[PDB]
Amino acid sequence: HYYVSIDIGSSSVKTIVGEKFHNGINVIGTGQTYTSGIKNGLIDDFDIARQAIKDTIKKASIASGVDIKEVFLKLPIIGTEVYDESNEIDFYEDTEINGSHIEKVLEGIREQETEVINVFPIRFIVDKENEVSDPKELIARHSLKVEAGVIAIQKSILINMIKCVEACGVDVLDVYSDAYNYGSILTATEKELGACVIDIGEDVTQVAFYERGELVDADSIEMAGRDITDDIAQGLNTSYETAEKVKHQYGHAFYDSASDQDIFTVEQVDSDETVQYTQKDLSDFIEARVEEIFFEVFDVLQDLGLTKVNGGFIVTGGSANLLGVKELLSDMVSEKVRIHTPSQMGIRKPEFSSAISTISSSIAFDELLD
Ligand SMILES: Nc1ncnc2c1ncn2[C@@H]1O[C@H](COP(=O)(O)OP(=O)(O)NP(=O)(O)O)[C@@H](O)[C@H]1O
Ligand SMILES: [Cl-]
Ligand SMILES: [Cl-]
Ligand SMILES: [Mg+2]
Ligand SMILES: [Mg+2]
Numbered sequence: 001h002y003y004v005s006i007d008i009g010s011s012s013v014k015t016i017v018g019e020k021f022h023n024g025i026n027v028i029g030t031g032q033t034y035t036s037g038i039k040n041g042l043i044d045d046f047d048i049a050r051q052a053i054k055d056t057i058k059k060a061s062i063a064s065g066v067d068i069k070e071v072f073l074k075l076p077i078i079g080t081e082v083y084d085e086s087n088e089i090d091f092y093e094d095t096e097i098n099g100s101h102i103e104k105v106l107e108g109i110r111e112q113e114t115e116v117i118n119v120f121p122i123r124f125i126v127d128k129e130n131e132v133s134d135p136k137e138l139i140a141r142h143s144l145k146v147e148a149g150v151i152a153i154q155k156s157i158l159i160n161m162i163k164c165v166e167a168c169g170v171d172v173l174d175v176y177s178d179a180y181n182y183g184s185i186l187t188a189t190e191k192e193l194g195a196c197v198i199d200i201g202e203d204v205t206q207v208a209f210y211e212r213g214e215l216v217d218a219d220s221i222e223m224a225g226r227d228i229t230d231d232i233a234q235g236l237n238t239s240y241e242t243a244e245k246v247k248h249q250y251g252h253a254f255y256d257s258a259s260d261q262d263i264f265t266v267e268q269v270d271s272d273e274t275v276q277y278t279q280k281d282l283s284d285f286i287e288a289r290v291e292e293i294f295f296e297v298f299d300v301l302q303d304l305g306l307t308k309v310n311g312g313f314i315v316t317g318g319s320a321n322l323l324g325v326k327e328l329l330s331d332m333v334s335e336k337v338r339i340h341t342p343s344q345m346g347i348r349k350p351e352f353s354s355a356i357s358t359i360s361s362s363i364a365f366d367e368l369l370d
Pocket of ligand 5: 010011035036037038039
């Protein structure tokens with residue numbers, strides 16, 4: 001059937017309706033609603049947040065022609081913990097391992113302040129000896145063990161995000177931390193060599209590092225697009241709103257590559273007076289803040305104890321639309337750099353990476369467990 005994801009963002013709630021193909025996802029509809037009901041990745045006003053989510057499901061329904069009733073929810077990398085764990089289940093007869101057995105051994109891991117939301121297999125072990133990655137259709141005489149990666153989140157976040165969404169008359173079939181979702185926007189080589197995803201949104205910037213095909217660790221920083229706007233507003237002595245517009249229209253994150261011929265007029269906040277500015281002027285502010293964010297990212301990587309980023313950097317999210325971000329980052333790092341943008345029609349904006357990869361995740365577990 002169809003897969004419906006919901007990304008409850010600080011700038012906009014995003015919903016994608018997709019269909020699973022052998023080698024991909026066919027997107028058949030989207031919904032997007034900007035709201036002030038979400039701040040810093042979390043619900044700021046329940047009622048307003050409910051309205052936006054409800055409205056977005058509506059938009060997604062009308063656009064896809066589907067009667068959305070069940071959805072997969074992405075969860076931000078806040079109050080999150082990643083760790084290892086293993087579990088084993090016993091058989092009392094020769095058993096050909098299928099999806100149900102895998103679901104059961106992982107389930108046990110998903111057995112106080114937090115709640116396990118994702119449990120993915122690193123490797124499986126049949127009858128205390130044969131170690132394999134895919135144990136399907138093979139025979140076990142005694143057992144099936146799993147060495148899994150585990151993501152858990154603070155109960156308060158989970159409980160409130162689900163309640164808010166289910167208050168719009170829909171069922172949350174499953175939850176997917178963005179820590180696991182990003183695994184899907186990376187190529188096999190990136191996930192192997194050791195790659196870092198950086199999603200710069202509005203209030204939150206998220207970081208997730210994958211290595212040897214698996215998620216190693218992740219975290220989030222409270223510095224992103226809004227902060228870029230704030231500096232612009234302060235610098236050009238103009239309102240937040242106007243600063244937001246010039247950021248989209250003339251924004252550039254690399255001063256040297258920023259243009260001078262590009263000019264625009266901005267009204268002042270303290271006087272009827274108006275002032276002229278060049279893109280290079282605007283870029284002074286944008287580069288400074290984006291640079292800071294990246295330095296914040298490097299600090300996260302060190303605390304996480306992750307020097308060495310062999311697979312390169314993948315930058316995505318709404319602020320990734322900013323010109324000069326690739327230049328800026330590669331100008332301060334030796335490893336490869338790229339901006340990820342979903343390829344499907346209608347969601348070809350970096351802000352859609354979370355929503356679309358949430359579907360990739362639902363599909364992955366669909367194929368794993370079925
Ligand atoms: N063309 C653009 N140029 C520069 N910035 C942009 C552009 N388009 C969107 N943005 C910024 O992208 C941010 C929102 O992107 P988004 O990835 O959707 O964040 P979010 O997911 O809604 N909220 P969150 O992830 O919780 O921080 C806002 O700060 C926008 O100003
Ligand atoms: Cl075990
Ligand atoms: Cl994806
Ligand atoms: Mg986001
Ligand atoms: Mg907001």
